[PDB]
Amino acid sequence: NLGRIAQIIGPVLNVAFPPGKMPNIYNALIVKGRDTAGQPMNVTCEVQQLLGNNRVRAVAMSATDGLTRGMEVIDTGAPLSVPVGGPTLGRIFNVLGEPVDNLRPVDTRTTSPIHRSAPAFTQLDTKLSIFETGIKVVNLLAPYRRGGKIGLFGGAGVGKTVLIMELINNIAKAHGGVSVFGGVGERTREGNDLYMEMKESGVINEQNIAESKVALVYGQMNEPPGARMRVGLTALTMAEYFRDVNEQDVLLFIDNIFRFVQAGSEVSALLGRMPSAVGYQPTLSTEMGSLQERITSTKEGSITSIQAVYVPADDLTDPAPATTFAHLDATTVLSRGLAAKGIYPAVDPLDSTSTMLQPRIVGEEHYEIAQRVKETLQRYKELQDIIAILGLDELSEEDRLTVARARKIERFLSQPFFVAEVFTGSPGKYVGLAETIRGFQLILSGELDSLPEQAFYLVGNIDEATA
């Protein structure tokens, strides 16, 4: 259709159509004039309100600078459509689905609306498979349910990305299916990196023989707010294809999904609504919820999403990350103080769960130990504030044992990464279930009470902790 821009107030457009034409809500519009001498059309928005008075409001996906009032807008006639299918692998995508890897256009078979009604109640499943990662803290104290969604939580700089990389290494380069990584509000480096790194391992196209098993869509930090509020949805629309069209088992790596909320935060008050808890929108729960229940496994296939979530000012009470949790079959909450100790990956063995920590789904040896481990990790944690001032001289011979063993646990709970070979300075190591399970069972048994602490710090297997 044809309306005219009526107000441009930052990345928000108030378009005015004729009393007949009414771009339906969420229907993407597209605007005609913009940057310095030359006519692009990158200015694509998404209707979000019918203010009324023949006038929809809308958030742009591109920068409005240079736009003018009266500029013809146009109602494409449906929601913003990204091109999906096999012809998206090995390429870097825009929030609009435009190729951003300078490799020619994209020769896709069909587009697809980033706006799709999640699976029904009878398209779901209950199968609970494990997902061996290769870190002495996950597979042991909070496993990965295939199809399920992983919540990798933490504050500013705690190893979340390094955590999403090791996973592509330990699981994606070897995963027998398609994978997709979304760039929701993060640094460009991390993009450039994860690209030129996925290239060397040939996870991308060394030659256009197209044997890639990855599709990239990157909307980084710099993009206006109406970009990181939806690149999480492009990445996912491209993932919601391999899941049901090619009955494939796809992974969804979202490096920070928070930058997705933060990004919505910013169009909230802007669109004229009333702010909510901690400055967030009233529609916070409706926004990251409708886009975590499409990112699921169904009978038609599966989506094993390993998503990261930013935790502002170190606070989990915060509405933005707090909200996520519900939408998680597991959680890996990282610590800044447990990271201030050098133990990496900085993962709090106490605050980190996984629905599949059930002996009905993994075993007793995996079930007890994990807890036995944690138990001592509760003890020492409730002993600290005590000994810190009350010393050890009066501590029982049965409680000073909790101390040594614990310090052997919280350290044996360290493990350099194959990607973090530049922060640790030592070779990465792949430590699966059994290797980890028993390694710890040899600790809880005081079979190693002689050995020092730093004997298990940044070590591969238990043996490597005794060498």
Binding site: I9, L67, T68, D101, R189, Y195, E266, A269, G279, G342
Partner: protein
């Protein structure tokens, strides 16, 4: 002409509500009768919300306004390199106009993911504590954090100084700094010939708020002219905190909905843009780069604060500086314990890696027992070795302002202590050791110093040849 001119409805607090001007573009410059420049942002239904760039005391309700038609352009070239520049790129030093041939935009899109390459190019700053444990490489964004009076600006003053000619172009952006204080700096940069390659894009406190925003943006655009020309830049934005504040002030004056600490809803697109437009372009663009070192002041060592929270999550590392670890001898105060560098040692040579990497493992072990020293009633030597080799390296890490060390001078020095030479010595003495030893090697042994750099690494010879040097030199104390 309600098309390219207009009337002024109101001027309240450096913002004006213009009426008419239908053709304006969002982001376009408008010109007032009394000749006051301002940008357009609120293309509201029947009125335009314009943010003035000056004393609005001049604008009068009835005066008209012309639409410059230009989307805030700034002049750029080589004509600068030594001119304390304003905010709309016009001299504020009194040396004439600037020969601008081209003219790039203040706000322009930043280099994408194809147009980029990892950081391998080092960036020497003259700070033994920075270029050995906090490796800043070219193109990389490195944050400088610290409360009031935390030697942060100083980390910067020395760094731009420490840039060998033809090596790196530098831009000094001051936002909300004091005139005087800016001057005390713009001088201490000339007296060392460093102002022949640095611009001083600065806007004092008195300067209208609608400028401290662009202070960096300009300061960044002026630098992007050298990047796309295969040249390398270093940008220091003295406080992004004082720029964030100036942001808040405009949104509220435009009547835009606020949030945490009255900070608007686009406070994160103030740094996630200045700091992104900085990078290492691919060799298919010029290998040109831009390293930005943004400063963000804190309050009570409160890192988790919004602005400092946000920025840290935009930069590739921090150089925390502490208010408790000043007088304690640590001058400059680098909390290398929390100060990180996401690029990695990748921004260092081999000659540094060999020492630095090792110095890393050291000043990382002491951190775990440090608090013991004062309460060490009877520790083991296996620990003593650490609480001994501990406060040693620190005094090497201490540095007098205005004196940036070369890379040679950087590696040779670490070598002394790191290798057990300064070991059995007294901390309240080591400072003069290096000072003395350095000049001693620069004078009598500048033959080895040039061997160091060129070879870029310490050969089995120069080592032994350093060994004979330091051992006998400590023996001259």
């Amino acid at each position: 002409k309600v098309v390219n001119t207009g009337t002024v409805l109101q001027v309240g607090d450096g913002i004006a509500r213009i009426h008419g001007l239908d053709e304006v573009m969002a982001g376009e410059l408008v010109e007032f009768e009394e000749g006051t420049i301002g940008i357009a942002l609120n293309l509201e239904s029947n009125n335009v919300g314009v943010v003035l760039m000056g004393d609005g005391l001049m604008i009068q309700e009835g005066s008209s306004v012309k639409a410059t038609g230009r989307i805030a352009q700034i002049p750029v070239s080589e004509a600068y390199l030594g001119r304390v520049i304003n905010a709309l790129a016009k001299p504020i030093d009194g040396r004439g106009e600037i020969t601008a041939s081209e003219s790039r935009l203040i706000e322009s899109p930043a280099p994408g993911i194809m147009s980029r390459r990892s950081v391998y190019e080092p960036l020497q700053t003259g700070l033994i504590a920075i270029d050995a444990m906090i490796p800043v490489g070219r193109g990389q964004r490195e944050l400088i954090i610290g409360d009031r009076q935390t030697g942060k600006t100083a980390v910067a003053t020395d760094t731009i100084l420490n840039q060998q000619g033809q090596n790196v172009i530098c831009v000094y952006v001051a936002i909300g700094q004091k005139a005087s204080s800016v001057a005390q700096v713009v001088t201490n940069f000339q007296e060392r010939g460093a102002m022949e390659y640095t611009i001083v894009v600065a806007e004092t406190a008195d300067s209208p708020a609608t400028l401290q925003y662009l202070a960096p943006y300009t300061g960044a655009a002026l630098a992007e002219y050298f990047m796309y020309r295969e040249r390398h830049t270093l940008i220091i934005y003295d406080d992004l905190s004082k720029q964030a504040q100036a942001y808040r002030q405009m949104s509220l004056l435009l009547r835009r909905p606020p949030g945490r600490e009255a900070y608007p809803g686009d406070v994160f697109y103030l740094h996630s843009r200045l700091l992104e437009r900085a990078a290492k372009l691919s060799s298919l663009l010029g290998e040109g780069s831009m390293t930005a070192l943004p400063i963000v002041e804190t309050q009570a060592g409160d890192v988790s604060a919004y602005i400092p929270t946000n920025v840290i999550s935009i930069t590739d590392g921090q150089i925390f500086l502490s208010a408790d670890l000043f007088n304690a001898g640590i001058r400059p105060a680098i909390n290398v314990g929390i100060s990180v560098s996401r690029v990695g040692s990748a921004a260092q040579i081999k000659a540094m890696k060999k020492v630095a990497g090792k110095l890393k493992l050291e000043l990382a072990q002491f951190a775990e027992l440090e608090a013991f020293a004062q309460f060490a009633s009877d520790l083991d030597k296996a620990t003593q070795n650490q609480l001994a080799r501990g406060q040693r390296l620190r005094e090497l890490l201490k540095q007098p302002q205005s004196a940036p060390l070369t890379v040679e001078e950087q590696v040779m020095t670490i070598y002394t202590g790191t290798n057990g030479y300064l070991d059995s010595l007294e901390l309240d003495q080591v400072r003069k050791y290096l000072v003395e030893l350095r000049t001693y090697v620069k004078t009598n042994k500048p033959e080895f110093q040039e061997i160091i750099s060129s070879t870029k690494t310490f050969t089995e010879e120069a080592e032994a040849l350093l060994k004979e040097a330091i051992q006998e030199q400590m023996e001259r104390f």
